[PDB]
């Protein structure tokens, strides 16, 4: 059984992969010029980029807006509810995943669900590397 009104925000997810996949690019590309791991703050009705401040030489945070001002954030969709793991949606003082210069990636699954029924349409996967693992509703995710 299904509500039948998944279509739109299927190919809403499938977007918000492919721009999220471009923004970890971005993330990576960032990293080897900041001197610190970059990393993704997510609460699922937003998410940021995150980068040092102050110094390079110590664990510190800020969110990535310098110029990617709600570009970094929000507007990929207009269909979905986001949820991860082993971390949590949260609007924590730190980011929820982090990136190193080298393309290596802190393991984590990211879940994307149809805000109009609740039902999932994708998933995301990492393993330790650069890029994410496209997956439709959770078929490579238990």
């Given at each position: 059984m299904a509500y039948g009104r998944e279509d739109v925000a299927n190919t809403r997810?499938?977007?918000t992969a492919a721009r999220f996949t471009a923004a970890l690019e971005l993330a990576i590309d960032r990293a080897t010029l900041?001197?610190?791991p970059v990393g993704?703050?997510?609460s699922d009705s937003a998410w940021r980029i995150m980068v040092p401040g102050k110094t390079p030489s110590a664990w510190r945070w800020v969110p990535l807006q310098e110029d990617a001002a709600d570009e970094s954030q929000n507007d990929?969709?207009?269909e979905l509810s986001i949820h991860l793991q082993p971390f949590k949606p949260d609007d924590?003082?730190?980011p929820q995943v982090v990136i190193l210069a080298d393309g290596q990636i802190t393991p984590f699954?990211?879940?994307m669900?149809?805000?109009?029924t609740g039902e999932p349409l994708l998933t995301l996967v990492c393993s330790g590397s650069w890029?994410?693992?496209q997956t439709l509703a959770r078929d490579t995710r238990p």
């Open positions: 997810a499938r977007e900041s001197g610190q993704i703050h997510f990929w969709d207009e924590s003082n730190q699954s990211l879940l669900a149809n805000a109009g890029p994410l693992d």
